[PDB]
Protein backbone atom coordinates (compact mmCIF):
# COMPACT_ATOMS: atom_id res chain seq x y z
CA UNK A 1 0.00 0.00 0.00
CA UNK A 2 0.99 3.63 -0.66
CA UNK A 3 0.33 6.18 2.12
CA UNK A 4 0.56 9.95 1.62
CA UNK A 5 -0.27 12.86 3.90
CA UNK A 6 -0.89 16.59 3.82
CA UNK A 7 -1.00 19.18 6.59
CA UNK A 8 -3.21 22.15 5.73
CA UNK A 9 -2.24 25.58 7.11
CA UNK A 10 -3.08 29.13 6.06
CA UNK A 11 -3.32 32.75 7.20
CA UNK A 12 -6.58 32.24 9.09
CA UNK A 13 -7.72 29.65 11.69
CA UNK A 14 -8.22 26.85 9.16
CA UNK A 15 -5.97 23.85 9.74
CA UNK A 16 -6.12 20.08 9.27
CA UNK A 17 -4.45 16.78 8.38
CA UNK A 18 -5.56 14.76 5.37
CA UNK A 19 -4.40 11.23 4.64
CA UNK A 20 -4.36 9.49 1.27
CA UNK A 21 -4.16 5.73 0.88
CA UNK A 22 -4.19 3.57 -2.25
CA UNK A 23 -4.44 -0.22 -1.80
CA UNK A 24 -4.26 -1.27 -5.48
CA UNK A 25 -1.81 0.38 -7.87
CA UNK A 26 -4.27 1.87 -10.34
CA UNK A 27 -7.22 1.56 -7.96
CA UNK A 28 -9.21 4.05 -5.83
CA UNK A 29 -7.64 6.43 -3.30
CA UNK A 30 -9.18 6.86 0.15
CA UNK A 31 -8.91 10.47 1.30
CA UNK A 32 -9.71 11.07 4.95
CA UNK A 33 -8.93 13.30 7.90
CA UNK A 34 -10.16 16.35 9.73
CA UNK A 35 -10.15 20.12 9.11
CA UNK A 36 -11.07 22.64 11.80
CA UNK A 37 -11.79 26.40 11.88
CA UNK A 38 -14.06 26.37 8.79
CA UNK A 39 -17.36 28.23 8.46
CA UNK A 40 -20.35 25.89 8.59
CA UNK A 41 -21.26 24.38 5.22
CA UNK A 42 -19.61 23.26 1.96
CA UNK A 43 -16.00 24.06 1.05
CA UNK A 44 -14.25 23.34 -2.23
CA UNK A 45 -11.51 20.74 -1.96
CA UNK A 46 -8.95 20.41 -4.73
CA UNK A 47 -5.50 19.27 -5.68
CA UNK A 48 -3.76 22.23 -7.32
CA UNK A 49 -0.86 21.84 -9.76
CA UNK A 50 2.22 23.02 -7.86
CA UNK A 51 3.73 22.01 -4.54
CA UNK A 52 4.79 25.63 -4.24
CA UNK A 53 3.96 27.62 -1.12
CA UNK A 54 6.50 30.40 -1.73
CA UNK A 55 3.75 33.03 -1.92
CA UNK A 56 1.19 31.29 0.29
CA UNK A 57 -1.53 29.13 -1.23
CA UNK A 58 -1.65 31.37 -4.33
CA UNK A 59 1.57 29.97 -5.72
CA UNK A 60 -0.01 26.49 -5.88
CA UNK A 61 -1.45 27.51 -9.25
CA UNK A 62 -4.73 26.17 -10.78
CA UNK A 63 -6.55 22.87 -10.18
CA UNK A 64 -4.26 19.99 -11.22
CA UNK A 65 -5.39 19.46 -14.81
CA UNK A 66 -3.04 17.10 -16.77
CA UNK A 67 -5.78 16.09 -19.23
CA UNK A 68 -6.78 19.68 -20.13
CA UNK A 69 -10.49 19.34 -19.25
CA UNK A 70 -13.02 21.80 -17.80
CA UNK A 71 -13.81 21.86 -14.06
CA UNK A 72 -16.38 19.37 -12.73
CA UNK A 73 -17.53 17.55 -9.59
CA UNK A 74 -15.59 14.34 -8.72
CA UNK A 75 -18.36 12.20 -10.21
CA UNK A 76 -18.34 14.00 -13.60
CA UNK A 77 -16.55 12.59 -16.62
CA UNK A 78 -15.59 16.18 -17.51
CA UNK A 79 -13.38 17.15 -14.55
CA UNK A 80 -9.88 18.21 -13.54
CA UNK A 81 -7.88 15.36 -12.03
CA UNK A 82 -7.62 17.51 -8.89
CA UNK A 83 -11.41 18.00 -8.69
CA UNK A 84 -12.39 16.38 -5.37
CA UNK A 85 -15.66 18.29 -4.89
CA UNK A 86 -16.68 19.61 -1.47
CA UNK A 87 -16.11 18.86 2.18
CA UNK A 88 -18.70 19.75 4.80
CA UNK A 89 -18.03 21.64 8.02
CA UNK A 90 -20.41 21.08 10.96
CA UNK A 91 -21.73 23.82 13.29
CA UNK A 92 -18.39 23.68 15.15
CA UNK A 93 -16.37 24.39 12.02
CA UNK A 94 -15.04 20.84 11.75
CA UNK A 95 -15.09 18.89 8.50
CA UNK A 96 -14.67 15.14 8.90
CA UNK A 97 -13.32 14.44 5.44
CA UNK A 98 -13.85 11.05 3.85
CA UNK A 99 -13.75 10.65 0.08
CA UNK A 100 -12.96 7.92 -2.38
CA UNK A 101 -11.68 8.88 -5.80
CA UNK A 102 -10.51 6.85 -8.78
CA UNK A 103 -9.09 9.67 -10.89
CA UNK A 104 -6.34 10.91 -8.60
CA UNK A 105 -3.54 8.41 -8.02
CA UNK A 106 -0.59 7.87 -5.71
CA UNK A 107 1.40 6.26 -8.54
CA UNK A 108 1.58 6.45 -12.35
CA UNK A 109 0.24 9.15 -14.63
CA UNK A 110 -1.91 11.11 -12.22
CA UNK A 111 0.39 11.13 -9.21
CA UNK A 112 -0.57 13.95 -6.81
CA UNK A 113 2.59 13.55 -4.71
CA UNK A 114 4.45 16.84 -4.37
CA UNK A 115 1.40 18.90 -5.38
CA UNK A 116 -0.89 21.01 -3.17
CA UNK A 117 -4.18 20.24 -1.49
CA UNK A 118 -6.33 23.33 -0.93
CA UNK A 119 -9.50 23.90 1.03
CA UNK A 120 -11.45 26.88 -0.32
CA UNK A 121 -13.61 29.66 1.11
CA UNK A 122 -17.01 28.75 -0.42
CA UNK A 123 -18.85 25.83 -2.03
CA UNK A 124 -17.55 24.35 -5.26
CA UNK A 125 -20.47 24.62 -7.70
CA UNK A 126 -19.13 21.51 -9.50
CA UNK A 127 -19.09 23.46 -12.78
CA UNK A 128 -22.85 24.05 -12.90
CA UNK A 129 -22.81 27.79 -12.19
CA UNK A 130 -23.25 28.88 -15.82
CA UNK A 131 -20.37 31.37 -15.85
CA UNK A 132 -16.79 31.15 -17.08
CA UNK A 133 -15.48 31.02 -13.52
CA UNK A 134 -17.61 27.92 -12.84
CA UNK A 135 -15.81 25.87 -15.48
CA UNK A 136 -12.39 26.88 -14.11
CA UNK A 137 -12.59 26.99 -10.31
CA UNK A 138 -16.20 26.06 -9.52
CA UNK A 139 -16.50 29.50 -7.88
CA UNK A 140 -15.00 28.07 -4.68
CA UNK A 141 -13.47 31.43 -3.76
CA UNK A 142 -10.20 32.00 -1.93
CA UNK A 143 -7.70 29.46 -0.55
CA UNK A 144 -8.21 29.16 3.20
CA UNK A 145 -5.49 26.58 3.85
CA UNK A 146 -3.17 24.33 1.87
CA UNK A 147 -0.19 22.00 2.15
CA UNK A 148 2.23 20.05 -0.02
CA UNK A 149 1.24 16.41 -0.48
CA UNK A 150 4.08 14.30 0.90
CA UNK A 151 5.09 10.65 1.40
CA UNK A 152 3.94 9.43 4.85
CA UNK A 153 5.09 6.51 7.09
CA UNK B 1 14.80 21.93 -16.23
CA UNK B 2 12.86 20.05 -13.56
CA UNK B 3 12.25 22.61 -10.78
CA UNK B 4 11.27 21.86 -7.20
CA UNK B 5 10.78 24.12 -4.21
CA UNK B 6 10.52 23.94 -0.45
CA UNK B 7 9.29 26.47 2.11
CA UNK B 8 10.92 26.00 5.51
CA UNK B 9 8.86 26.86 8.62
CA UNK B 10 9.12 25.79 12.26
CA UNK B 11 8.40 26.68 15.88
CA UNK B 12 11.00 29.43 16.14
CA UNK B 13 11.93 32.40 13.90
CA UNK B 14 13.69 30.22 11.32
CA UNK B 15 12.14 30.41 7.86
CA UNK B 16 13.26 30.28 4.24
CA UNK B 17 12.72 29.17 0.65
CA UNK B 18 14.96 26.61 -1.03
CA UNK B 19 14.89 25.88 -4.76
CA UNK B 20 16.10 22.70 -6.43
CA UNK B 21 16.88 22.49 -10.12
CA UNK B 22 18.16 19.57 -12.21
CA UNK B 23 19.01 20.28 -15.87
CA UNK B 24 19.83 16.69 -16.95
CA UNK B 25 17.76 13.76 -15.73
CA UNK B 26 20.53 11.91 -13.90
CA UNK B 27 22.74 14.99 -13.53
CA UNK B 28 23.65 17.24 -10.54
CA UNK B 29 21.03 19.20 -8.58
CA UNK B 30 21.53 22.88 -7.81
CA UNK B 31 20.14 23.75 -4.39
CA UNK B 32 19.85 27.44 -3.61
CA UNK B 33 17.87 29.97 -1.62
CA UNK B 34 17.84 31.86 1.62
CA UNK B 35 17.11 31.01 5.26
CA UNK B 36 16.75 33.69 7.94
CA UNK B 37 16.51 33.73 11.75
CA UNK B 38 19.47 31.35 12.25
CA UNK B 39 22.25 31.71 14.80
CA UNK B 40 25.56 32.70 13.21
CA UNK B 41 27.59 29.70 12.02
CA UNK B 42 27.10 26.20 10.60
CA UNK B 43 23.72 24.42 10.47
CA UNK B 44 23.03 20.85 9.38
CA UNK B 45 21.02 20.61 6.19
CA UNK B 46 19.35 17.34 5.25
CA UNK B 47 16.60 15.67 3.30
CA UNK B 48 14.63 13.50 5.74
CA UNK B 49 12.58 10.47 4.67
CA UNK B 50 8.94 11.53 5.04
CA UNK B 51 6.95 14.46 3.67
CA UNK B 52 5.00 14.26 6.90
CA UNK B 53 4.50 17.35 9.05
CA UNK B 54 1.63 15.94 11.12
CA UNK B 55 3.64 16.24 14.34
CA UNK B 56 5.89 19.13 13.30
CA UNK B 57 9.35 18.48 11.88
CA UNK B 58 9.70 15.36 14.06
CA UNK B 59 7.36 13.33 11.90
CA UNK B 60 9.72 13.79 8.93
CA UNK B 61 11.64 10.80 10.28
CA UNK B 62 15.42 10.15 9.82
CA UNK B 63 17.78 11.36 7.10
CA UNK B 64 16.58 9.96 3.75
CA UNK B 65 18.63 6.77 3.56
CA UNK B 66 17.48 4.42 0.72
CA UNK B 67 20.87 2.70 0.48
CA UNK B 68 21.12 1.91 4.23
CA UNK B 69 24.49 3.63 4.83
CA UNK B 70 25.91 5.52 7.82
CA UNK B 71 25.75 9.33 8.00
CA UNK B 72 28.47 11.32 6.22
CA UNK B 73 29.32 14.69 4.71
CA UNK B 74 28.03 15.27 1.11
CA UNK B 75 31.51 14.57 -0.26
CA UNK B 76 31.83 11.14 1.47
CA UNK B 77 31.15 7.89 -0.32
CA UNK B 78 29.61 6.65 2.95
CA UNK B 79 26.61 8.98 3.32
CA UNK B 80 22.84 9.11 3.46
CA UNK B 81 21.30 10.25 0.18
CA UNK B 82 19.79 13.13 2.18
CA UNK B 83 23.19 14.18 3.59
CA UNK B 84 23.73 17.71 2.24
CA UNK B 85 26.23 18.83 4.89
CA UNK B 86 26.07 22.34 6.37
CA UNK B 87 24.85 25.78 5.44
CA UNK B 88 26.41 28.92 6.94
CA UNK B 89 24.52 31.77 8.58
CA UNK B 90 26.14 35.23 8.51
CA UNK B 91 26.22 37.70 11.43
CA UNK B 92 22.64 38.70 10.54
CA UNK B 93 21.33 35.14 10.85
CA UNK B 94 20.91 34.70 7.10
CA UNK B 95 22.22 31.67 5.24
CA UNK B 96 22.57 32.22 1.50
CA UNK B 97 22.36 28.58 0.54
CA UNK B 98 24.05 27.38 -2.62
CA UNK B 99 24.94 23.71 -3.02
CA UNK B 100 25.43 21.28 -5.85
CA UNK B 101 24.86 17.59 -5.20
CA UNK B 102 25.00 14.54 -7.45
CA UNK B 103 23.50 11.99 -5.06
CA UNK B 104 20.06 13.50 -4.54
CA UNK B 105 17.85 13.54 -7.64
CA UNK B 106 14.60 15.09 -8.83
CA UNK B 107 13.81 12.10 -11.07
CA UNK B 108 14.60 8.39 -10.79
CA UNK B 109 14.39 5.83 -8.02
CA UNK B 110 15.44 7.90 -5.06
CA UNK B 111 13.75 11.18 -5.95
CA UNK B 112 13.45 13.65 -3.03
CA UNK B 113 10.09 14.99 -4.22
CA UNK B 114 7.47 14.71 -1.50
CA UNK B 115 10.09 14.34 1.24
CA UNK B 116 11.23 16.91 3.82
CA UNK B 117 14.10 19.35 3.88
CA UNK B 118 15.26 20.25 7.40
CA UNK B 119 17.63 22.88 8.71
CA UNK B 120 19.07 21.89 12.09
CA UNK B 121 20.10 23.64 15.31
CA UNK B 122 23.88 23.00 15.27
CA UNK B 123 26.71 22.00 12.92
CA UNK B 124 26.62 18.62 11.22
CA UNK B 125 29.85 16.88 12.27
CA UNK B 126 29.79 14.93 8.97
CA UNK B 127 29.99 11.66 10.92
CA UNK B 128 33.38 12.35 12.52
CA UNK B 129 32.20 12.93 16.10
CA UNK B 130 33.16 9.48 17.38
CA UNK B 131 29.80 8.65 18.99
CA UNK B 132 26.78 6.68 17.86
CA UNK B 133 24.80 9.88 17.29
CA UNK B 134 27.45 11.13 14.85
CA UNK B 135 26.91 8.22 12.46
CA UNK B 136 23.13 8.75 12.49
CA UNK B 137 22.44 12.49 12.59
CA UNK B 138 25.89 14.10 12.60
CA UNK B 139 24.92 15.62 15.98
CA UNK B 140 23.15 18.45 14.17
CA UNK B 141 20.69 18.77 17.05
CA UNK B 142 17.05 19.78 16.77
CA UNK B 143 14.98 20.62 13.68
CA UNK B 144 14.64 24.40 13.49
CA UNK B 145 12.53 24.47 10.32
CA UNK B 146 11.36 22.12 7.60
CA UNK B 147 9.05 21.82 4.60
CA UNK B 148 7.75 19.29 2.12
CA UNK B 149 9.67 19.29 -1.16
CA UNK B 150 7.13 20.05 -3.89
CA UNK B 151 6.85 20.50 -7.66
CA UNK B 152 7.33 24.09 -8.89
CA UNK B 153 6.57 25.81 -12.20
O1 LIG C 1 6.47 7.72 -7.14
C1 LIG C 1 6.94 8.72 -6.59
N1 LIG C 1 7.82 8.63 -5.59
C2 LIG C 1 8.11 7.31 -5.05
C3 LIG C 1 7.25 7.01 -3.85
C4 LIG C 1 5.89 7.30 -3.89
C5 LIG C 1 5.13 7.02 -2.76
C6 LIG C 1 5.73 6.47 -1.62
CL1 LIG C 1 4.74 6.11 -0.17
C7 LIG C 1 7.08 6.17 -1.59
C8 LIG C 1 7.84 6.45 -2.72
C9 LIG C 1 6.47 10.05 -7.09
C10 LIG C 1 7.34 11.13 -7.12
C11 LIG C 1 6.85 12.35 -7.61
C12 LIG C 1 5.53 12.52 -8.07
C13 LIG C 1 4.64 11.46 -8.04
C14 LIG C 1 5.05 10.21 -7.55
SE1 LIG C 1 4.06 8.99 -7.52
O1 LIG D 1 9.59 11.13 -11.66
C1 LIG D 1 8.74 10.43 -11.09
N1 LIG D 1 7.39 10.45 -11.24
C2 LIG D 1 6.56 11.35 -12.03
C3 LIG D 1 7.14 12.74 -11.95
C4 LIG D 1 8.16 13.15 -12.82
C5 LIG D 1 8.69 14.44 -12.73
C6 LIG D 1 8.17 15.29 -11.77
CL1 LIG D 1 8.84 16.93 -11.65
C7 LIG D 1 7.16 14.91 -10.89
C8 LIG D 1 6.64 13.62 -10.99
C9 LIG D 1 9.28 9.42 -10.11
C10 LIG D 1 8.97 8.06 -10.24
C11 LIG D 1 9.50 7.15 -9.34
C12 LIG D 1 10.30 7.55 -8.28
C13 LIG D 1 10.61 8.89 -8.09
C14 LIG D 1 10.15 9.88 -8.98
SE1 LIG D 1 10.52 11.41 -8.79
ZN1 LIG E 1 -11.15 21.90 -11.14
ZN1 LIG F 1 22.63 11.65 7.36
Residue numbers in the entry:
A (entry chain J), B (entry chain A): 1 to 153
What does the report in the manuscript say about this coordinate set?
SOD1 is a homodimeric copper-containing and zinc-containing enzyme, serving as one of the cellular protective mechanisms against reactive oxygen species. An alanine-to-valine mutation at amino acid position 4 within the SOD1 protein (A4V), accounting for 50% of SOD1-related gene mutations in the US, causes a rapid and aggressive form of fALS, thereby reducing survival time to less than 2 years. While the mechanism of dimer destabilisation and the increased propensity to aggregate remain elusive, several structural and molecular dynamics studies have demonstrated that the A4V mutation causes structural changes in neighbouring residues close to the dimer interface, which potentially perturb overall dimer stability even though the interface interactions are generally conserved in the crystal structure. On the other hand, several studies have shown that Cys111 could be a potential target for the development of compounds to stabilise SOD1.
In this study, we successfully co-crystallised A4V SOD1 on wild-type background (no C6S mutation) with various compounds in C2 space group and provide direct visualisation of the binding of ebselen, compounds 1, 4 and 6 at Cys111. Compound 2 was designed to enhance aqueous stability of 1 by incorporation of a basic benzyl morpholine ring system; Compounds 3, 4 and 5 are simple benzyl analogues which have greater flexibility than the parent drug substituted with electron donating (−OMe) and with electron withdrawing (−Cl) groups. The structure of A4V-compound 4 shows a different binding pose, although the chemical structure is quite similar to ebselen with only an additional methylene linker. The seleno-head group of compound 4 is almost perpendicular to that of other compounds and the chlorobenzyl group extends along the dimer groove, filling the gap between N-termini and C-termini. The chlorobenzyl ring of compound 4 locates near Thr2 and interacts with Ile151 through a hydrophobic σ-π interaction, strengthening the binding of the compound by filling the gap between N-termini and C-termini. Notably, compounds 3, 4 and 5, which are methylene-linked analogues, greatly increased SOD1 melting temperatures. This result can be understood because the methylene linker makes the aromatic tail group more flexible, allowing the chlorobenzyl ring to localise between N- and C-termini and interact with Ile151, which is a residue critical for maintaining hydrogen bonding between two monomers. Thus, the binding pose as demonstrated in A4V-compound 4 structure might serve as a bridge, reinforcing the interaction at the dimer interface.
